Symmetry: D2
Subunit: 420 residues, 4 copies
């Protein structure tokens, strides 16, 4: 029963860990999710862009099973294992970072961001960090501070550390330009903190919870220029955009400038708990032995899954397929724009696409319309996710391995849900 | 080759992720670890107290495979699952908290400590946190601040947030008494922060990296009293001491006073990435919906493994067994105390036992002697771990499921390694 | 000799205490300063807007001597005196605060700002403070944090406290509007700190060292509105703009909205060390007995001088006079705007008037032209002061008591320095 | 009327500015204070150790009037003057700082400490500051954090900056030794902050508000040793102990080790608002020009007063007189220990002497007995001050210029007030 267990969950767990759906997952494969009462759903959430290679991809299951017949945990900081080194070598070969790449593995994306910040601070000896409004980087203390949304991520968890600031993110719909961001960064350097006291600038090439806003090329170039000038570490948070989501393996592959450090997680292990930081070896080697670590860091099962994820992305050509699916979804949303004026924007990159809804009679961002369209899709068996500053963005996070027929059915459902 | 991948590792990964052993893991079962060249080792590390049920316990592997046939990740905050709820119910039933309990799951122990601090700050509306010298609570920013050992955990990652203080932990060999701890707390209340601005007091009932120092009953009682008097949340970090290690399920079960919050990890899932926080349901309900979470939180495979772990500790009487094994180890160490004057102390609870070595001609802490015994034991096939402030303590973290014959062989090897 | 003592100065005092002039003061009266070698200077600095009533005003001197016959210091928090209370009563009656006013006295302007922040934190129980870029509020740690100009005030003195942020200040010449300020405040609320975690918003009605930028009426109204909505304390820093400088007694008297707190110093005692905070009695009474104080606070001689200063401002009609002299200066500057293309702006209120210079060919802010005009004037005997974000602003801080003929001589000198 | 003005004072000023006496000062000279109703009091407060040279010493009045006929304020950072340089040279010639000295002047002692910390931070590039429990250093934000007494100086003004810690001050009565302090410093280095991240260790040679505890020679030597070893700036806060109070010109003259920086105020100008920092020239020169300052800093009248105070201390042999008067008061207090069992301790240095009362029927610190003696002596026309962690200590801060007959009358009054 989904109601019995709804009450059991509300009684056993705190209200702080909120849950979107009131049905309980029973099984899942690729992009199909069945609950405990037999209802099937098309998963356009992918565990929040974690299942780019799909629920229980057979190669991932095979790799996890093979490793489960060897060992699940030795603590890498005690007894190492080759799979860690080989995955790090492959990431170094593929990651677009400055200089020669070195990679370390942790467990959660928040741990990856934390360690990127630790590496930057140890390299520069500086305290400051600049992030962007609307950015999301984790739910730990420091990663909350870096996160550019207060409600609900930061309510009641303050005070937050000093030397951490935010500048507005370029958004065409809201009149924020690249030059607005650069002016805010300059106002930081002239009012708040010395440029030679800022250790890192951290940014998402495509903001996840921010509404799938893409960083303009000028912005990435300017960030690279400022970091080169002032000795600041450039951090690209590719935790959500990484691994073929944006049409290339990493979102940063769409830009000429390379960041110094890059954080990875979610789809890195295709449904297993793994994260990592990859970047310039001169910067990564700043902490001494013992300065970085984590007990679950580089979990053998998750690392095997990540090897499988890389091979799947390659052999099934998930980058091109991400581009094709994103184009089809854009076509559907733009065609619907003619009949549903509430659609205010269609943005994104590759298969990282989102639609933002304004009230057609007011012009103000309306979360109500987004919620009701999300209700309609769900009742039709389509699981959609909400994001944005005002919670009026629907982001589409289908697995890149979703079959064509199921994707077309999902487009039909989305068309019927857009139009009342 | 155990030495070609050593160079590969040094070239691909950052220096900051330190590694103790020069060999690479190939397979592991219970307390037996086999490297890529075939060498066998008796694992007295258990992945740093993560494998209380031993490497790949058959029931844990069966549970993980069963779940692997259903789904590995749905993002719990999007789509929940019953295994999370039932595991929370079991932890609530077993946790040493006064009154109604509530449990939330995350992925890493540092994440659990972070959420305990978030819960305490949301409940009290205060900033301050008081921890203990020699304590270890994670490698994230806030958990580094709570950690009471600067070298090597905090070197280069400051500055650290305000309102976080440390008081000395009682140690009979170092002359620190419970009254010393309480006087330092009072000095904090009179010099650094008013008690009504302290949100939590976090402590390990048995210090992990601190040298297995056991908290006196008077200290736990004074902490409970100070917390009730000033409205401070009492946090017990049982990440390393939890799950049958100390002879009871949780170390706090050795004391009459119950904490408000308790953090769990490591052996909770017996080799899978899972952590948690259980406590006073009213305090746990302090953060509003949306304020707590984490993408991997309560990973389904790890949840299944944790169910298995609870059932294994029950059905195989691992508390009783930890008491027996700790007693055998203490007998071996005391029988050696007459031939080895370097044995300065033997401390701990249950099967969380450590031996501290001083120099037999100076009386000063001797880390070299401990490293030499460790060196000798590793050549005989026994993997031992060091800890303590001065690196002069050897901690015994054998899996609780180690067979009697292998344990007795390890005792013989240990007697030889102490022999000089 | 001015040289001998210049070298002795460099040898005995730190380089960090910067000194603008190469001559040493010997005598001073009203707006006339004589160096130790006999050279006379028309003082358009007034000790940085401290000598509004002019150097050694006879009434101030007579009051100071009369008190000197009584006592110079008793420590007010030990033994109080009636001059403190009567000055507090006069300030309470004259301050632009809604409802019952209370006034406390301290010694320096930074001390007044510090106590205003302390009062706001005690009244709200919140950590945060929001200030404006280009603002100056003192050289102590918290007041450096509030100051919105890094160079040179904050170089090497970090890190600075968390929960302290800055927003742009409206300027017609730099493209910053009131709505830009309000949007940045909203971005703070949405990205950095909860609105109901901000204790105060501190602002200058007329930015002193920032270039004499006048706060538009809409900005003050919006600040008042936000404070009423979020329960934030509205702090007006009138240390430099206060006491008849802007054509009315306080700059806030030009606006319909009233602040919760107002800080006073500089011309408060007309050349004696005294500061003060006046505001809402219910808010002022937030700190408990024993929370506010200062050994020198409300020094008797400075309090007598401040009594004299109020009586001088009233009897010699210094508000009206400030308006007249500001109009004469504006006539001179606007007249010169036809021959000097470098004159890009002439702004201010009353006798708080500044001219900003841009390059006549490029249009960029030209600090070199400003310096050039300052040296020309200095060579003719006119002591002028620089300010602005780029050091390209000349501020006119003559004593309001300056004789008309001396003012006209200074205007002629200024006209000569503006062209050739 | 003292009652009518008592009510007026409570009406016009905030409750936070606490006031000890309910009468209002009318006149004062040397050690005799007259209120508005004609009552005379022997001033054993000296405005909280500010009038070592006495109320309105004739030489100080003469210097102040001479300067008042010249100028009262020019803003030293705009136009300098001789008296600043000559006073700095005299301080450099007399101050016991390691190496050749430079001196800067400010206005309040809190500002002096603020600038000492600024100088240490600029010199070292480090954030950390270590202070002592029971120490008092100012009522500003940073000097609050440095202060080691929460009630009443810190209540409601948090949260406080990170990297600021406190260690116990050696006290014979409370069982705190030098080695306790050194162990707490080592615990800071091993649990809280790296030694190479601490910019300064600030301490009072004789704690003022803490109860006149004298720093033992071993403690000063250990602070000097640790500061030399780790690059930490050693700061002696002699705002209260300076200028012949302790029997030598500065308290540090009783010790063989020299601090790097020394802060001065209070008696520095003998009742006029002045403060200063004197220290090693190389360290003082750390902030770039424009980094240090203050509008009122180095007030000409106060600087003339400081010249006069130095001359008075020399010509009237105030150091020797401080020793003599301290010995006479100690004789009076020890002889009273026989009939007053409440006298638990009589401590101090020179004429910086305090008596600590415990309850003779339980052994508990008694602020009530101290206050009864205070009011008993006040009824007889003798004005005493309280202090201590528990408010149970009587301080004797008579002016050093007090005549012998008045001192003997005060001793008579003190003897009668000690007994019931």
């Amino acid at each position: 029963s989904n109601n019995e267990f709804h009450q059991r969950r509300l009684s056993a767990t705190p209200r702080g860990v909120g849950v979107m759906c009131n049905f309980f997952a029973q099984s899942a494969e690729n992009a199909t999710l069945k609950d405990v009462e037999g209802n099937e759903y098309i998963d356009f959430a992918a565990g929040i862009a974690v299942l780019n290679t799909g629920h229980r991809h057979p190669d991932l299951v095979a790799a996890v099973e093979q490793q489960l017949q060897q060992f699940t945990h030795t603590a890498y900081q005690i007894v190492p294992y080759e799979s860690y080194v080989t995955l790090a070598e492959k990431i170094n070969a593929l990651a677009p970072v400055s200089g020669q790449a070195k990679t370390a593995f942790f467990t959660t994306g928040a741990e990856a961001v934390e360690n990127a910040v630790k590496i930057a601070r140890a390299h520069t000896g500086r305290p400051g960090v600049i992030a962007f409004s609307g950015g999301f980087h984790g739910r730990t203390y420091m990663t909350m501070a870096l996160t550019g949304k207060v409600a609900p991520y930061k309510i009641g968890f303050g005070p937050f550390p000093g030397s951490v600031y935010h500048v507005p993110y370029p958004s065409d719909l809201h009149g924020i330009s690249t030059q607005d961001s650069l002016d805010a960064i300059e106002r930081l350097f002239k009012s708040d903190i010395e440029a030679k006291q800022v250790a890192a600038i951290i940014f998402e090439p495509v903001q996840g919870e921010g509404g799938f806003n893409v960083a303009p090329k000028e912005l990435v170039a300017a960030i690279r220029r400022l970091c080169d000038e002032h000795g600041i570490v450039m951090i690209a948070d590719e935790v959500q955009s990484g691994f073929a989501r944006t049409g290339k393996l990493f979102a940063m592959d769409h830009y000429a400038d390379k960041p110094d450090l890059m954080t990875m997680a979610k789809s890195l292990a295709g449904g297993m708990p793994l994260s990592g930081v990859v970047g310039n070896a001169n910067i990564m080697d700043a902490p001494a032995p013992g300065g970085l670590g984590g007990t679950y860091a580089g979990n053998p099962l998750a690392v095997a899954a990540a090897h499988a994820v890389l091979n799947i992305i390659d052999k099934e050509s998930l980058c091109e397929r991400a581009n094709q699916l994103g184009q089809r979804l854009k076509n559907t949303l733009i065609d619907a724009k003619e009949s549903v004026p509430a659609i205010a924007a269609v943005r994104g990159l590759g298969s990282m696409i989102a639609v933002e809804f304004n009230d057609p009679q007011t012009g103000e961002p309306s979360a109500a319309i987004a919620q009701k369209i999300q209700q309609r899709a769900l009742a039709q068996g389509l699981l959609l996710l909400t994001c944005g500053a005002y919670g009026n963005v629907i982001r589409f996070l289908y697995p890149l391995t979703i079959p064509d027929a199921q994707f077309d059915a999902a487009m039909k459902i989305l068309q019927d849900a857009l139009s009342d």
